[PDB]
Amino acid sequence: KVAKFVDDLLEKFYGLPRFYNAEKMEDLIGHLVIGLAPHTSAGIVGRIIGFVDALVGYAHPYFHAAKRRNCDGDEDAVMLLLDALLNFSRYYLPEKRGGKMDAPLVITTR
Amino acid sequence: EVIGGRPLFSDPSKPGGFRLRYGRSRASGFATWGINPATMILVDEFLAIGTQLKTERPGKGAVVTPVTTIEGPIVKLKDGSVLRVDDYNLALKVREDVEEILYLGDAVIA
Amino acid sequence: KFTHDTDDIALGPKMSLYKQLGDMEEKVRRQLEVAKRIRAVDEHGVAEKILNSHLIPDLRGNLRSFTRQEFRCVKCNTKFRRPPLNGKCPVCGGKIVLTVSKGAIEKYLGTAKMLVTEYNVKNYTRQRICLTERDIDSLFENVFPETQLTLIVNPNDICQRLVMA
Amino acid sequence: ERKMKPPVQVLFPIGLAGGSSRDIKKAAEEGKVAEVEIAFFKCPKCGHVGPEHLCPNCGTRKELLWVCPRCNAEYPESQAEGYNYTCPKCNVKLRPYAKRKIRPSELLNRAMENVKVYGVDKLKGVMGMTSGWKMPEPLEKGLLRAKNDVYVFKDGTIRFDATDAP
Amino acid sequence: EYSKYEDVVIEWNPSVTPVQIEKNYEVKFDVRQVKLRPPKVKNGSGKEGEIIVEAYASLFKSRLSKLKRILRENPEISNVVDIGKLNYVSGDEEVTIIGLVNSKRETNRGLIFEVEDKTGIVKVFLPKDSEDYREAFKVLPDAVVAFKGFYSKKGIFFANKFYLPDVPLYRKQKPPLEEKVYAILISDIHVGSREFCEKAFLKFLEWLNGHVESKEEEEIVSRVKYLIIAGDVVDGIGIYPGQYSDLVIPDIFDQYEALANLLANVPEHITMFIGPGNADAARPAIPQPEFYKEYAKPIYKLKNAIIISNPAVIRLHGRDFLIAHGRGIEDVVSFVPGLTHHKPGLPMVELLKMRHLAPTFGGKVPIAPDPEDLLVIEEVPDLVQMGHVHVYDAVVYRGVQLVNSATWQAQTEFQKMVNIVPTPAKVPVVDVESARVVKVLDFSGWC
Amino acid sequence: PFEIVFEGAKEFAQLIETASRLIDEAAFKVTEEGISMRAMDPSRVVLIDLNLPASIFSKYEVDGEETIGVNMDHLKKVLKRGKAKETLILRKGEENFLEISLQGTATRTFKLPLIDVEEIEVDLPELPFTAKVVILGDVIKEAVKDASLVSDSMKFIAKENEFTMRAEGETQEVEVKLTLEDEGLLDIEVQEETKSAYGISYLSDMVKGLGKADEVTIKFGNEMPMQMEYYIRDEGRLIFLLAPRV
Amino acid sequence: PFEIVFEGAKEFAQLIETASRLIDEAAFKVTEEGISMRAMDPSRVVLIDLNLPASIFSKYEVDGEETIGVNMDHLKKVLKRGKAKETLILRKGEENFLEISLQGTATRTFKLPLIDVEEIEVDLPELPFTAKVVILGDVIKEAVKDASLVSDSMKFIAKENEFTMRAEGETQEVEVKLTLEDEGLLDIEVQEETKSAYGISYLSDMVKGLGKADEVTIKFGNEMPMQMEYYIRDEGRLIFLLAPRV
Amino acid sequence: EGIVSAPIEGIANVKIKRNTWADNSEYLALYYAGPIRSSGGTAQALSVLVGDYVRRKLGLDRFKPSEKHIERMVEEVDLYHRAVTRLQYHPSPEEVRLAMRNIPIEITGEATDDVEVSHRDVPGVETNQLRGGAILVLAEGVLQKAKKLVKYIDKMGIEGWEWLKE
DNA sequence: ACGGCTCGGCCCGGCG
DNA sequence: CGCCGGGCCGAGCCGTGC
Ligand SMILES: [Mg+2]
Ligand SMILES: [Mg+2]
Ligand SMILES: [Mg+2]
Ligand SMILES: [Zn+2]
Ligand SMILES: [Zn+2]
Ligand SMILES: [Zn+2]
């Protein structure tokens, strides 16, 4: 659904060619995401290669360590890279202390 | 403390609880345990892939992951027979006749 | 590298049973059968006493907060530290509702009484539960008097049995 | 998936016109007028005013309006830059927002005509914005989110939460 | 270790002969004596959520009406006008308003109030240069006060005088008594606790039986007739988390049995009046009609024990005694600055001046949803007794004594944590005729 | 392996619903003569029993006696799917399932599981009733509906040739008075003046679902429970026992 | 001490319910010629006058003029219990209680407490109304129900032998045109073209529950309050005065 | 490593204060906001260490609290556990006194809880309510993570922290 | 320790 | 044509000694 929304946004709002062109979840393989922890301000880029029938997020221990997570009950968020690139803005962040937590202010590429 | 609805699987360092095995599976090692799916099935499916549990010896908290090479529970049936359920389909077939869980199974800790 | 191997990475139950139980009584009962099945748990009193320190805090905390609570208008969200003398919102025609209802106090009393009667706990917890029920009954003496009789008495309750002993 | 405490599909303030659920479409269809604090942008050429980044008449990027708190003089961004974001006639720092009245009917009709999305039943917004800028979001994005059944977060992203395993 | 004072027997000394005196006494107020008619729903299909609100509103209405009737006694207050019909008055007239204090704040000019009554709310300002500013500063909300001043059509009621229900300055002395009679006050025994000072209590019980050194104390003992206990006679069950390790007797039945066995040793010529407290098996919120009978039966069965309520008023030889536990002192201590638990006699005077025993709603005291307020001091007493503080004090304010009997429980972990120094084993001795404290016994040597 | 055929499934659905209005679980005792039911609501305030002999059943065939337990919610939900003219059929094979079938313009069979419920014998012995009255369903129904307007309780007063039922509120009052010369009452037999009071909720729950052309008999005494009866198809009988107030 | 007997309690219930949709508390005056009524909407935008002369009532007797003050909600709840063929009796005695008795198959009596309410007597004489028209209830009912969809404000236009109702919105629009040849338009009398607008909510309240075969008189002027009146039983009548919006 | 937002949002402000009651010297105070409450034990202790190093490198003196400051801190630590959260750690009062006496900077902050204190109008402290950010730093920072802190001190060539080593 | 538990209001379908 | 009743939605709240 997120990819369909992104394609509709690209075709109807900006007038640009569609990007994902996916009809099933197996068509998202090879596309990039961003992983962010609920207490940090930097994200990391990951790639999709497969799916499982469980309710967990499998990844390398380096991937979970790079988000300062311990992997003993923690939970993190994932978002498509292009959706975040188009949609994120620093003018929607709350003004009180704590509005910059959970924000991709910078992303690591390696 | 025990919250209503959240079971307690073993008493501190009590024989018959979780058997300690030293090792690391394909999908475990950071802070997670390795558990046979048979002992997930035979505890009324209160344990699922990714369910957290508060541990005693190594740390405080872990996530369970299926390992099919370690041993499973030993159960006592309603007619008096004693069986070793190291398989998943066998547990599914036998679940309804279980009178007492003699042994709980193994846990692989890194 | 790795030490142990597994046939499948997503083999086994996929959803916890805790998410498929609605009532608190059903949750407690299922958890207690689970604890009874396992040989190395010793539910019979241990799980009750440890579990009773999750319902007793709720009961006593709700009972305490009932007598010092703030009221609010349904139409607005303005809160009043003291009930209005007119019974209605001064800046509305809307009616005043409580923030701690009477049914939010005694929602776990049935399960607590079941846990007390079906298992052997220390006399301290049993007396605490009996006194909690007595206090709940006594706080609402002049507001909700007992005006309805019943056909049969003695529903196998434990408080009167302890008192008569 | 992740949703706010009241679910939100567009970061647009509605106040009380939308009801308990902050439904923008219901307020638009009932002809209600709402007063909220937002940022208004002004077209340098023709002088359009409203909470839009692009002028519908000519398609030329507008500029943010700065307003005095006590005094009520509006200064565009280019002029407010010279004034150091302080009112000349007063001695109080300027602000990019003020309490203003909006009519959801015209805005929603323009958005629907813009993205060609008409059959949407609900469109939830916020009671008020939390930033210091109070810059709103385009309503076309909210319509496309409502059409595809996806939600939004505090920074304008769609997120999915899951337990992590190695 | 489960001894419950089963074999604690003290016999009267056959050396001191008590003087024959006719016990003239009668209970003047009891909570389980006013018949509170429960409320009727506005229609035939009501629910629980509305009756409670209506009962609370009725309670506050009754409080306001009773305190207004008390206020309209002094000749100085006159020309009362309703708050609702205040816009229909001139700007050059002397008017008064009586209502409940919603909230108060402080500014450079003075104090701003939100006095409210049955017919709407109004804002009242009092200048800092007023003569009653000091008195009105240390007032806590939900009390009933009277104001005097000029009402402005702008929206502020400017005032120049402050009033409280107070106590009359002049009173008529009572006729003298024929023979002298004495009374003893006790509170906060806390039977069943590890910190309960049992040896001092036993020594005091022997003192009541004639084991006395000085001749004047012999005469006082021979003249003792009445004894009053102001609650907290047992340590309770489940008062706070972690109490199980603090209890020698972890059984409420056994606690009351031990207390009855202790109190059975009083002489047969003394009448005991016992009231409940915040640790006993009784109603969670004040007023408490009595103990739970099925738990306090061993103390109900005593030959000369009389069970009273909280609060209750007793009339011994024409002298009125107002007996309460004293949970309302905490509100005065925590509001007014400069007041501590080490000197509880001043918050007692504050409560007496405001003529209510627990005004603040939503603080440190629980208030029951009764349709009638029984915590208003309707009549002026001769003596006032309180406990719950574990510190002794005694002052006199305009002819009424304000005692605070000490505890019988040594300092425990909590009072050590929060810096309170108890004074256990102190017992006031009062004179019935004078209605004043004439001596203080101190049995703290053993405890 | 017993076959049951019932004409007018709507009536059966209505009686099942009026039995379900108070209790949630019950067990049916069916013998060669007929089928019977009896249980009590968890508040221990009301008692309902029901009998259905072989005469009213158009086709009866049963071997021995069997105790069956059915979820009353699912039972009434299935029964509500019938029509006014279809014939209701109840069958049970060797499996522990109840086969509920309806035969109108088409035949539909519902499979519904059997449940086990503990059966407790609870019979209150016949008590000395000082008054009896026979009235129509319509009059008592409207009287209950009016009494629910002012108060949550309704008061009965019995006297020779005078049967009055009232309810007082805080300010308002409603009184229903009628005699032998009126229409709603058929006959009245009292031995002494009688007075009682009963909750509005229970009375409204029990009288709801009665036909206008029906005869209901009320037996009650002084500060003692009340019994309400009404014949079903001239052969059955319904017993309601309600505790009084005060 | 007056005794008033009325037939067809349903009609009285409808009349009171129509009178109860704008006001909650008001006073009733009773006099030899009949019963009057004049209440005021709390919003001070719609005026209601109701007059019930004595001839309509079957047995109407009273001496002098008295005032009666009753809350409308309780009264509407009491009268809503009446059926199509129940006799409605209004009786008052020395005691300050209003007795409403419903005579039928069972004599059920209600008692209501009178409440003191202030009376503001403002008699409005004939105003210069540019247009006076008479239409059936169904036509105006359907017109209002159609106009409720598009917007919340309804426009009236009266021209020479023409009656047009219109409502406008952001994008939608509905119009209704009435001519003499139409059955709904009985007659029309206008001196010059007039136009004004009103609110749908108040209009819906005044026209809802209007009989199909009723001739309704409409009088209004340029940006002036509208006068609506329809006769009941050919003897009593109700007058509505709705102030225009903007 | 520049990942978690402790530097960005944990540290509300930095100010230079004067030790008027004792010697009128110059010291440094760190204001801790709400978000520092969820940064982990290691981030807070390193923040205190960095504050100490910067105050020593800027030629500033050390904090010299009065007794009232100590009593206020002990009652705040006692109160927050009783009324807000379990603290995940319970320092003894003597440990609190030792830490307050031997820390060269003032660990303070704004008010985050709607609870009033007993020791009021303490000089230098501008609030009479619980300061959750600072007390959590003290409890779960230099105290709970003392071993890692002393290891960092040894690796870092920092003196003046012998009391923590003892 | 915080998602789970009570209330109240507001439309939307049947249903008679 | 007018109710009865469900099913959503949104508010609030969760041990404690003087
Ligand atoms: Mg972790
Ligand atoms: Mg006490
Ligand atoms: Mg005490
Ligand atoms: Zn309101
Ligand atoms: Zn432009
Ligand atoms: Zn300006």
Residue numbers in the entry:
A (entry chain B): 885 to 994
B (entry chain B): 333 to 442
C (entry chain B): 1051 to 1215
D (entry chain B): 664 to 829
E (entry chain A): 173 to 619
F (entry chain C), G (entry chain E): 2 to 247
H (entry chain B): 112 to 277
Can you provide the manuscript's text about this entry?
Family D replicative DNA polymerases (PolD), found exclusively in Archaea, contain an unusual RNA polymerase-like catalytic core, and a unique Mre11-like proofreading active site. A catalytically inactive exonuclease variant of P. abyssi PolD was chosen (H451ADP1) to prevent active digestion of DNA substrates (hereafter named PolDexo-).
Two primer/template (P/T) DNA duplexes containing mismatches were designed to trap the polymerase in the proofreading mode. The first P/T construct contained three consecutive thymine mismatches at the 3′-end of the primer, while the second substrate contained a single G:A mismatch at the −2 position of the primer. While the template strand points toward the polymerase active site, the four terminal nucleotides of the melted primer are shuttled toward the DP1 nuclease active site, located 45 Å away from the pol site. Importantly, the four terminal bases of the melted primer are shuttled through the exo channel, with the terminal nucleotide present within the exonuclease active site. As expected, but now structurally observed, the active site of DP1 contains two metal ions coordinated by four histidine residues (H362DP1, H497DP1, H560DP1, and H562DP1), two aspartate residues (D360DP1 and D404DP1), and one asparagine residue (N450DP1). Two Mg2+ ions were modeled in the exonuclease site of PolD-Exo, as the cryo-EM structure was determined in the presence of MgCl2. The terminal nucleotide of the ssDNA substrate, which is located within the exonuclease active site, is present as a pre-catalytic complex, with the scissile bond positioned between the two Mg2+ ions.
